[PDB]
Amino acid sequence: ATRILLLVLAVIIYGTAGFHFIEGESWTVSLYWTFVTIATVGYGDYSPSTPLGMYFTVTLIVLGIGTFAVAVERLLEFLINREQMKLMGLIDVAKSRHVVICGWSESTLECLRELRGSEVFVLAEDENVRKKVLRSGANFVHGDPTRVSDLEKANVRGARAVIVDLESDSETIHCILGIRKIDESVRIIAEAERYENIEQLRMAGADQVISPFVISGRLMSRSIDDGYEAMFVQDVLAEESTRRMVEVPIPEGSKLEGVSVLDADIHDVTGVIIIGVGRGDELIIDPPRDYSFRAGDIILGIGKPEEIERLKNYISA
Amino acid sequence: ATRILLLVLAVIIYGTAGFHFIEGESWTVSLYWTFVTIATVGYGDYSPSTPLGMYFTVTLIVLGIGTFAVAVERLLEFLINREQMKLMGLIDVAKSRHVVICGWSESTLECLRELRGSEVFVLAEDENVRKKVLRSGANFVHGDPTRVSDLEKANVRGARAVIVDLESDSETIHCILGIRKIDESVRIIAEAERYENIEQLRMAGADQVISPFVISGRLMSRSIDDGYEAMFVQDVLAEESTRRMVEVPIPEGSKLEGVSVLDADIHDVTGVIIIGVGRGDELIIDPPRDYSFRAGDIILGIGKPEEIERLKNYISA
Amino acid sequence: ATRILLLVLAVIIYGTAGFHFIEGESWTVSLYWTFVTIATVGYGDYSPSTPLGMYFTVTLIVLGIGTFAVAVERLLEFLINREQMKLMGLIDVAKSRHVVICGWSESTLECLRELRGSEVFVLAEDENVRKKVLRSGANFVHGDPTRVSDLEKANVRGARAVIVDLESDSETIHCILGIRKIDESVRIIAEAERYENIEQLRMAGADQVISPFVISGRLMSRSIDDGYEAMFVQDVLAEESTRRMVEVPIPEGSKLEGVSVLDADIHDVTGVIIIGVGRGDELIIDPPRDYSFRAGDIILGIGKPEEIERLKNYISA
Amino acid sequence: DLEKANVRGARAVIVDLESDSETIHCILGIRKIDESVRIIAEAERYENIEQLRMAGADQVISPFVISGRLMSRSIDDGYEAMFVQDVLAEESTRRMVEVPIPEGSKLEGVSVLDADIHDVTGVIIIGVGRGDELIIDPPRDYSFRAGDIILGIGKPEEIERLKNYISA
Amino acid sequence: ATRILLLVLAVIIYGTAGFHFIEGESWTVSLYWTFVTIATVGYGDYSPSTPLGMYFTVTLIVLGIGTFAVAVERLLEFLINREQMKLMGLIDVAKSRHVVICGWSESTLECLRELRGSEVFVLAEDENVRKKVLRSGANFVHGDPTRVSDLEKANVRGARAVIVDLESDSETIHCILGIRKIDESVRIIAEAERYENIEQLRMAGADQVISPFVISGRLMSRSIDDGYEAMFVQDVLAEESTRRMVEVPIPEGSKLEGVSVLDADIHDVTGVIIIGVGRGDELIIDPPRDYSFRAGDIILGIGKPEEIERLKNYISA
Numbered sequence A, B, C, E: 001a002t003r004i005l006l007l008v009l010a011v012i013i014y015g016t017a018g019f020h021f022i023e024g025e026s027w028t029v030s031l032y033w034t035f036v037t038i039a040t041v042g043y044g045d046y047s048p049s050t051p052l053g054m055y056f057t058v059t060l061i062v063l064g065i066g067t068f069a070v071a072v073e074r075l076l077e078f079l080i081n082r083e084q085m086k087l088m089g090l091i092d093v094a095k096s097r098h099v100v101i102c103g104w105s106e107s108t109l110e111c112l113r114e115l116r117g118s119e120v121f122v123l124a125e126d127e128n129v130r131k132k133v134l135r136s137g138a139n140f141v142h143g144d145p146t147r148v149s150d151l152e153k154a155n156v157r158g159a160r161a162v163i164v165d166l167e168s169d170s171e172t173i174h175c176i177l178g179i180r181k182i183d184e185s186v187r188i189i190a191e192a193e194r195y196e197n198i199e200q201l202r203m204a205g206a207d208q209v210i211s212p213f214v215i216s217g218r219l220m221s222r223s224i225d226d227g228y229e230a231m232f233v234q235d236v237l238a239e240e241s242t243r244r245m246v247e248v249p250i251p252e253g254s255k256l257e258g259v260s261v262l263d264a265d266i267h268d269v270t271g272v273i274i275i276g277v278g279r280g281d282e283l284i285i286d287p288p289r290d291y292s293f294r295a296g297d298i299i300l301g302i303g304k305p306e307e308i309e310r311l312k313n314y315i316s317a
Numbered sequence D: 001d002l003e004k005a006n007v008r009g010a011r012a013v014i015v016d017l018e019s020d021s022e023t024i025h026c027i028l029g030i031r032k033i034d035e036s037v038r039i040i041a042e043a044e045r046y047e048n049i050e051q052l053r054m055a056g057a058d059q060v061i062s063p064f065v066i067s068g069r070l071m072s073r074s075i076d077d078g079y080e081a082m083f084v085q086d087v088l089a090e091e092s093t094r095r096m097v098e099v100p101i102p103e104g105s106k107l108e109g110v111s112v113l114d115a116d117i118h119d120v121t122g123v124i125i126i127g128v129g130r131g132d133e134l135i136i137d138p139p140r141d142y143s144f145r146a147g148d149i150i151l152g153i154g155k156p157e158e159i160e161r162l163k164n165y166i167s168a
C-alpha cells in the first residue's frame, strides 16, 4: 500500500549517495541525474566515465525496473480487485441526493422511466435482478434490504426518498421498520399487497402507501356488467390517452391569492375539473364555496393537455 | 473520460512555459524539448544547465509519470469493464444483415450447421444457454425475447430474418407480436408445438410456421402396421441418404421461358419428380398441363444428387 | 516461469558479444552499454558509428521489446490467475493464530462482532455464503468442512480455536471427528441442535458444547404462566441492559491469596453475586464456606458495570 | 387464518417462524385480533429485539444472540458456557427454580438479611419479582409480601428445603 | 489481429521517409534513427536541427505512442479473453497421452490419487464439479459427455484410456456408444450400477466393466450371520492392511520360461497364493498342473508386501 513509496525513496537515496561519492558531482547534479536515470529519459550530459560507476548504474537500472515491476503489479492487483468487487454489487454508496429502491418488480421498473439513471440505487440480493438493473440503467448494491447493517451501505440516511417494494408484505413492514430506525425524517413510499396490511404499513412509518391489487380487485368486480369507472381510471391514470391528472402549485404573487373558488371559477374559464386543494400535507377533496386560496397551495385537477397550459398561465403572475 | 487530454495539455503547457522562461530558448525548441522529455526519449541536445531548471525537470518528470499512471489506469479500467460486460451478454448488436435466433433448442442447433458463425445472434436469458452458444460459435445477447425493449438491443429492425423457437407456445405468440410492432416487413420463421396454435401463429404475423410435433404425431400413428410414408419422409427430408428435396430457380433467358409442362417434360428427360412451381409466394402443387413457365419461378422437385445437376444445366442458358 | 530469466540472460549475452567484437570496446563498456540500451535509457556516450553495428542495434532493440512483451504477458497472466482464484475461495491459509469457523449461520455472525476481521477464516461451500462473508469482513475459504483433505487447507493444525456450526447435527459430529484426527489439542466449540446429541458431540471430542434450541425450548414452556426466569436470562446473557455476567482472574499476588469466601466477603463489599470459581477446567457452582482461593483462579459473578470495576480493583495488588 | 386456530381467548401464543419478518407480521396480526393475549416470540437477529417489543410481544427469547456471545467468550476461557450449559440447558446438577410465596407463611414482612435463605437452604437468590418487574439483587431494605416470586439456583436437595421453608 | 504489424510498418515507413528527405541523411541512418526513436531510446547522435524536422519528430512521437497504446490494448484484450475462457472450461485439449474422465463421482476421485495431476482431463458439465476438479489438481473441460461433438474437444481420439462414470446407466451406455464411434481401439473402463446393465455395457463396447453396487449387494446379504468373505474382500482389495493383490509380469529370459506350475512351485517357495495367469487378454483362474509358462505372461497372486519382493526376484534373471 505505502511500502511502494518507501522503496521508491530508498532507490532515490541509493542513487544519489552512489553517484555523489563516486563521480564527485554536486548533490543537485546527482539528484537530477537519478531522476533522469530512474525515469529512463537519459539526457547523457553527466554519464559516468568510471567503470566502478558504470557497474553502479547497472544496479540502479535493475533496481529501477524492480520498483517499476512492483508498482505496476500493485496497481493491477488494486484495479482488478476494485473492478471485480464493483461488478457484483459489494460497494458503498457515496452520493447524497440519490433514491434507494428496495426490491425490484414491475412497479419499480415503471418508475425508472421518469427518473434519471445515475440517481437511483437498487438494493436487492438476487442474481438476475443485478442484470436487469444493469440493463435498465441503474446501479446495483448487493444487500439484504431488511437488515439494518445493509440499509446503511446504500446510505439511506442521506437519501432523497426511499421506495419499498418487496416480494411479500412482511418484508415490506420489516424494511419500513428498519428504515425508520436510521432516519426518522426520510420519505418512504411503500406498496401494499393485501387490504389488511395498509394500516400496518402506515403504523410502521410509511408516508405514502399504494395498494394496486386492491384497486384491481375492486375494478374487476365492477366491470362484469358495464364497466364505466374502469375506463376512466385506465384512460386517466394509466395511459393518459386524452386526459391527464396533474397538480399545479400556487406561486408567490400569482394573481389569485385571497379569492374564493366561487370568484376564481377555474372550471368554466379553463376547462379543468377541480378535485381538491393541497393545503399542507392534507387533501380537501371537493372544497367548499367559502375556501380562500393561499400561497404555496396545490390545485389537483383533471384536464386535457391543452387546458393545463391554459390553467398554468391563469395561475401565474 | 476526457479529463486525461486536459491533464496532458496542462502538463505540456507547464513544460513549455517552464522551459522557455528559464532556459531562454525559442518556443519551438521548448515545444520539441517537452515532447521529447514527456515521452522519455531524451535526445540530450538541449539539456538545462541551470540548477533552477534542473529542479524544474524533476517536477516535469514526476508529472509525466503521473499522467502516464492515470492514463494507463483509465485504459485498464475501461478494458476490464468492457471485457466483463461483453462476456455475459449485456451488449448492443451493431450489425445490419444478421440473423436473430430467439430462444435455443435442438431445432435451432441444427439450423446453425448451415449458416455462418458470426452472422447469428442468439437472444436468450438462461445461463447454460450462454455456454452452449459460445461453444457452438454464435454470439450471445442477454435479454428477454418477449420484451420489446430487449428485442431492439439485438437490432431486430435491421435483421435479415428472425427465427423464433421458445419453450412454450405462449412465448412464441408474444415474441411474434413483439417483433411485428418494431418492423412489419422482417421475415419470421416460427416453430409451433400444439396443433391448435398454427392458426394463432399465422394470425400473429409469422411468415412461415413449422410444426414438427404434429408431423411426428401423424407419422407415429401410421407406422404401427406397415410404416411406408415414414421411410420416405425420413430418407428425403431428414437424412438425405440417396434422394434430396431441392428447388431450382428459373433465370433470365433460361431456354424454357414460355413452354408448358407437357412440352418441357422434365421428369422423363432428367429424372426429377416435379412437385410444384413457386409463382410468387404461393405453391401450386401438381401444376396442370396448360401451365406455362415464366422468369424467376421456382421448380420444386425430388431427385438424386446426380439428377439435380442434369436439371440445373437443362434450365440454364 | 523461469524461462524469462533465461531469455533475458540470452539477450544480454547477445548484446555484449555483439557490441564487443564489432565496436571494439572493453567488456565492461559493452556490459554497461547493453544495460543502458535494453532499459531504453540511452545515454548516447558510446553510440555505434559502424553501419554494421547500426544494423545490430536494431536487432537488439527488437529483441529487447520482445523480452519486455513476453515478461509483461507472463506477469499479467499470473496476476489475473491469482486474483481470479483468490476471489472464489480456492486458496490455502498461511496464518498461524487464526480462528476457523466451519459453516455459517446467525450464531457465527454474532461471534464475528467481538473478534477481528483478518483473524477469522470461514470454511464453507455455498455461493451466497461467500458474499455474506466478504461483506462481514472475514476471509472465505471454499471447501467441504467434513472432508479431512479440505480441513487442512484452512490450516486447522495451527489454529487458535475452531468453531463448528453446520446445518445439521450429523455434519457437526463428522466435522468434530475430522478435526480430532488432525490435531488432538486444538479447542473446538460446537453447537448442538437436538437434546439427544449433546453427549454425542462431547464423545466426538468437543471441548465446549452449546445448545441454544434446548434453552429456548425450556424457556418457552416456562413462560406461559408468568415468565420470570426468561427475563433474567434475556437481560443478563442476551442484551445486558443493566447487569452483566463477567468472570475475573486472580493474578499473582492479588491481596486475597489464601483467604476463604467467608473472610473475603465479596458480595457485601462489592455488590457482585458470586456464582462459582474456576479451578482448572472445572466449575464449582456455589462454593462451600471453607474454600480457599489460589493463584490463577477465575471468579464468575453477576454485577452491574459499575460493580465490576469495584471488584477488579479489590482483587488486584 | 389466525382465527381458524382460535388465538382469541387462549393461554399463550408461541411465535417462531422461518425468519424475523414473518414473526413481526404475525405478532402485528395477533395484536389486531386479541389485544390482551400473551405472546412469546423468538428473535433471530440482535437488532430485532426492540422491534418485537414495539410490535406487541410480552416476552422475547433470542437464542442466537446468547449462543453468539457465548461462542466468542469461550475461545480462551470458557467458564460462562459451563455455567449456562449446566444450569439452563441440561440441568445436570443445578437448576433454576421459581417458587411462589403463599399466604401467611413465615416470611411476610421480614427483611432479606434475617430471612437467612442462603445459609439454611443453600439456594443462590438471583432476584425477586412482583408484578412483571424483576428486581435482581434485592437490597437489605426490602420486604417480602404474599404473592412474590423468588428466583433461585439450587440442587433438588435444596429446592425442597426452600419449599418446606416457604410453607406455613 | 494482424493490423498491428501493418500500423507498425506504416509508422516505420513514415519515420524513414520523413527523416531522409528533411535531414538529408543516408537511408540506413534514417532507419537506425527511427528504430531508436520509436523505442524511446534516444541516443541523440543524429538529432534534427531543422525546426521543420523538429515539428516532424513530434508527429513521430505521438504516432509511436499511438501504436504502443493500440498494441497494449490488443494484448490486454487477448489476455483477458483467453484467461476468462480458460477458467470456466471452454478450451480444447492439445495433449496426446492424457486420460479423459467422463463424469465425476467418488470412484473417480479415488483413481485420481494414483495418477498424475496434469495427465487427467475431467469432462463434465456441472458447476461445482469444476471447483472440485480444480481443487483435486485436474483440468476441467466443459462439455456434455454424451454429445459426440463435445467428446472431440477433450481429444478422445488421441487419449490413453477413457474412464466413464456418469450419474445413471443410460448416459454410461450412450457415452460408450459415442466414444466407440470416434476411435474403435481406445480403452474404455466403465462403471455399472444395476446388475442387468453389465451385458449392455459390454455389448456397447467397453473393455472393462466394474460394478461396485452388485459387490456390496452380495456382501451385505452374506454378512448377516457371520461375515467372513467381507473381511477378506475389504482387507485385500479396499484397505490392504497386511495383504495385497498384485500381478507380476514375466520378462524376457526370466529363469522360469518353460517350466510347469508343479515344477515352479511358487507358493511353498515364496508364500504367494497363485490365483491365475494372464495369457493374452484372458484369465485362467486356477491353472492346471500341466500349464507351462511363457514370455510376457502375468501372474496374479495374493501376498504380504515382503513376499512380493521375494517373488519379483524369483521371476527375474
Ligand SMILES: [C][C][C][C][C]N([C][C][C][C][C])([C][C][C][C][C])[C][C][C][C][C]
Residues within 6 Å of the ligand: A039, A040, A065, A068, B038, B039, B040, B065, C038, C039, C040, C065, E039, E040, E065, E068
Ligand atoms: C511515452 C511512454 C514511454 C514508456 C517508456 N517505457 C520504458 C520502459 C523501460 C523498461 C526497461 C516503456 C517503453 C516501451 C517501448 C516499447 C515505460 C517507462 C515507464 C517509466 C515510469
Ligand SMILES: [K+]
Residues within 6 Å of the ligand: A039, A040, A041, B039, B040, B041, C039, C040, C041, E039, E040, E041
Ligand atoms: K526511454
Ligand SMILES: [K+]
Residues within 6 Å of the ligand: none
Ligand atoms: K501494462
